[PDB]
Amino acid sequence: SGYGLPISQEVAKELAENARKIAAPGKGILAADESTGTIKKRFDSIGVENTEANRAFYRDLLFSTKGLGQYISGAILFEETLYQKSPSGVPMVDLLKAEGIIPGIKVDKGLETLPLTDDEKATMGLDGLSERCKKYYEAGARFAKWRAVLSIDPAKGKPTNLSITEVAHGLARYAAICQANRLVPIVEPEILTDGSHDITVCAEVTERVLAAVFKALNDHHVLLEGALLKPNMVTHGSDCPKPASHEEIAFYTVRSLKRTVPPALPGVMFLSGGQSEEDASLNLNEMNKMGPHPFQLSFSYGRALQASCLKAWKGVPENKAKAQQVLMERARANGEAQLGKYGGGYVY
Amino acid sequence: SGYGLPISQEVAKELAENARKIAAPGKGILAADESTGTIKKRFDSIGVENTEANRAFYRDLLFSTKGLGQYISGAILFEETLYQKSPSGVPMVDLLKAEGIIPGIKVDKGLETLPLTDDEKATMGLDGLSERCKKYYEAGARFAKWRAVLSIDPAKGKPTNLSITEVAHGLARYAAICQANRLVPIVEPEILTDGSHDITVCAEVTERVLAAVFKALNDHHVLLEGALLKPNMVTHGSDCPKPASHEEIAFYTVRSLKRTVPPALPGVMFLSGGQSEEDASLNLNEMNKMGPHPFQLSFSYGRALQASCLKAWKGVPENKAKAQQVLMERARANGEAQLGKYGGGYVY
Amino acid sequence: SGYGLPISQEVAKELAENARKIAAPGKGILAADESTGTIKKRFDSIGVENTEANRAFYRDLLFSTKGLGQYISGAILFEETLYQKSPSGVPMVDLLKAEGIIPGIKVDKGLETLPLTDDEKATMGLDGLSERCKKYYEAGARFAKWRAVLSIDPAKGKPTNLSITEVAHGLARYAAICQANRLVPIVEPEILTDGSHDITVCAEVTERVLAAVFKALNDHHVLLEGALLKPNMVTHGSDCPKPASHEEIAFYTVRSLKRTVPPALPGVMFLSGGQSEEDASLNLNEMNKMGPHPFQLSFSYGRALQASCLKAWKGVPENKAKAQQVLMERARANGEAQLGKYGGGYVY
Amino acid sequence: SGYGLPISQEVAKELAENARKIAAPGKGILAADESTGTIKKRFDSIGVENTEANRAFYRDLLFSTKGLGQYISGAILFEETLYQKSPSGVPMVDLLKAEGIIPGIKVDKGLETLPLTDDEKATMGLDGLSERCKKYYEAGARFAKWRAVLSIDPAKGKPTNLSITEVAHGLARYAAICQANRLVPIVEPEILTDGSHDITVCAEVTERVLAAVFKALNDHHVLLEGALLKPNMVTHGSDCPKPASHEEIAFYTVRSLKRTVPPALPGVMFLSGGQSEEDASLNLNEMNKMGPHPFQLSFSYGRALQASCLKAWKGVPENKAKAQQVLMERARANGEAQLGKYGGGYVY
């Protein structure tokens, strides 16, 4: 024969049902999986000491927000948080379950330079991944996340063939391992905005990358019905003085997905990748005005859901109520954007 | 840079508009492009001499059928027919245009064994293809067709890697050449039904083949918005005593497409590949009961539109009216099947 | 540009010089890198308790054999042994250096099933590999080893495409990481002898696998001048009642290498993979009667250098002298075989 | 199974024997296969009318040179010449056979732009190739030639992935078809010298291209024992004011081959690609001073064997003797260069 053995129907059903629950209409993912060093940066921007207690306070602030599950279908956690208790002693997973938010877990081990490239990155973490997935499922996670990173640099030929091949291979292996352990894999091939390239260059690169990713998923026997994609939107580079219009970003982003993503995939959950809170909502809203689409177009936002929540918290306990109000405003905006109903706050 | 140069917006617009016209709701393609030797077989089944006059009579019988354009959006021609006149002196293309049927042209040069394979086939015809496309466009063709063939044989490991790679390469080159010459390419990777394999084996092979085909189309800069796919339905092998149910064929066929075909492609126009006239209609109808779909699911039928028309004609002139009536009955059935409205005549 | 950055000339020179020293005429590698569980098996065959002291005694028995460096250019160690002292307190690396034997280190983390394959194996260990390599170099290792495993099973289509792709990817990543850290990578794609296939089937599979491996090495910017290959010899399957002649094994093995291995690689150091001590020597000798070759054909033997040494030791201290004599007899036989001078003890 | 069927031992033996005869020590190929339009250019440089009679006169001048077979093992012909008679009525093939020179035939149909590339070229000619090969064998050809062309342009990312993939595919198909018809295929992937890139850029590109070519040859079941490679030497771009030294060209050329070409290939027969007659000889001589090599390094020269012969002929009949003397001087120089005996006339 030589083909993939059949996936367990019972496992496949669970994966597909959970992927559709995560990609639920009017809802998206809160990406709260900042590692210890990344959350330091976020905290440094508001001058807060990165104690375990402060991290526990902040994650509890997020996850105990009443009514958050109206707009948030899932929450990506860092490992620490998956096994953490709020300051009041409630396990973080229990706060999520009380809102009906599905817990998810970041499972990559970060980035390492590929030898003899110009600082292009492999994502590490396959070793022990299968055993980690089993433990995380027992702890309550039902989906996973693995971040790969590519750069655009026309003068240096980035992303190089080796970069794309490595990104696709790691994502495909990770996704198949997740599905073997009953976790829905979020496949995150992030093309960074670094540089002064045009939106049309971002579109070309995104198409090449996604074509390679999805071919590799097929090669590794990944069940698209039980997976999710977390791509960059298609935008101008971050060094461009003029940001592309929301209409342009929506057009090129949808076009790049429809040219590469098979429609058995239930959901595309965009990363916000440095965009402002309002841009992230407006760009998603614009895409869902041009629906209906073959897959759900929604959000998996970190900064774009938390930026103002952090600035409102300021590390000050007393600002907890106000901070959660801010988070709800952004969760509502992006849930409405998923439906193409947010009111603000063809090229071949 | 290293990426594909931008396709002409004017050419791309024409290709996309013509592809959508071919994949029009409630309509499909009449495949009337039997070569001289293939039409001999079809004629041998009803005992008719394969004279040029008989071929001209029969193609005129088909294309002059009044009202055919209600259900037929396009007609694939053999080169002879593109430049032929009916017995009454009317160019065949003019009969088509009078019904508003778009003319199309078969442009491959047939099959040749790949060296050191077990009679696995390459499709020939790239040499001079670009110049042929230009002439065919001037003669009135607006779409093309290229047939590749794969076999399932688990004991022999068919289709082999070399078979799939060759099929994908030839289809991608052909499609890019067509689009450079303003012809919509129909991409036909036919997996033959030969053998006693199960429908699930057909499904696995179809997925592997289509994944490879679409990756190659992307590699060769083929515009999916201006292309069409003509695949096999997913069925049991032809040596199986029990034909799969229409519900099963519909489920596995749609599943295989949704797992591999990006939704920028406007249409999937199935070949009937030996099925009976009624099975071809019922299977398509069943797929369009389970819509709406991300692309149009329709037909590009030869035998399944002509079988009874031939048997009613019998080479006898006087049976021309009755023969056209039969053709209209089948065109109507398949147009209705495209809409999921023909009344007869999840596994992961 | 988009190509690999230039490797450091200083690092490349060191790698190339050490690879040529390992592939030195009349010499080969002693593979003494059995993990804790593998050495248990070897010890179980002679009824010896797998204490750390016994492992230290045995490795000291091997490495303190006087005159061993006449025939052994390098010794592959398990991590424990790299940082271990003999029972008398001499570091194992110091015993090696006193004989001028280069220390090497096994750096893979073993095998894991690829999801939805029929128990086909990925090799794990890239995570932390670069940091491990740095530490191992400081501890005295100058080469590394990474074992991948493939199976032949015609009825199951093994090795599958996914198996070969994964094996090649892991070996290429590992090799580039090693070279970035000044370790010569031994690239070991072992096709197991399991099954009843003919030597011609082994030859076909070996060629396909090595073609894929070397293409991946090129893709990952691996310096062939500073690498070594450790392949299976080409033989009948282990279930065959008739073992292939030494002349046949030599012919098909050399043919498979010359059809796939670029001659910039300095050495091919065969694994013995279950062969008897005498067969391993006779097969290598036969290959080097048909020289001179474009690369050194030599040995990296574990069982084929140690089998009789173990049976002579029997865990009994007093048998240490006799055991080392046995080891020297086999080291001499294989060094002589490297030169085509061991006296015993074209098809396209 | 899924692997290539076994090549006929009888056919394989013939191919291997003829490939070794072509790659014979102290000998190389005269490339006299200029098409009608290419020979016009060569003739335009000396002001001669491109009549069939003039072409027949010139090819007869070349092939009737007494003693030419001491240094020329084979002669590549254009189709016209294969079926042509000298002005005196002797078939061209008979002149070759009288000197024991093997006739060869160019079988590609030239170059066509790949759609949506920046004028990157596919080589056409697979259609009817197998039937042409049969006729050419009956006419006396025992080897074939197929030219593919790649460009270096770092700013444009040339050669692009599509260029390399297409070149490799066409060469592999052509080579397998030739071998099925008892013709030794010369595999010619010519990287043009156009541009101002350094020799190290040429080296990197040549390695990438040859790695891809040889992987494709393996994929298509091409017998390396019965094939030949005709690559560019590795040199500075033609816009560079300083030509690389003969020592540099020799070093980088040999290095690029040893890093990519399996040593089962019997011969590498360099194209001269615009070099002067004397540079072509000196560069080859320098490579064969650094032997012995795993394959024969020799020549398949057109301009570098004929330039002075043409200028001495000047279209004037009376200069026939002098012209043949010039040709013999260059044939002798390059035969001596093959042996590293022409007297004039490590970086990782």
Ligand SMILES: O=C[C@H](O)COP(=O)(O)O
């Ligand atoms: O975009 C995904 C995550 O925010 C990245 O988290 P990380 O920096 O810890 O890998």
Ligand SMILES: O=C[C@H](O)COP(=O)(O)O
């Ligand atoms: O399925 C497509 C056509 O009916 C095949 O026509 P052909 O046999 O002449 O290639």
Ligand SMILES: O=C[C@H](O)COP(=O)(O)O
């Ligand atoms: O063939 C190489 C080694 O003997 C394998 O050692 P291992 O079983 O510990 O991976």
Ligand SMILES: O=C[C@H](O)COP(=O)(O)O
């Ligand atoms: O390098 C090979 C030949 O000289 C090219 O001949 P051609 O220009 O007719 O293709």
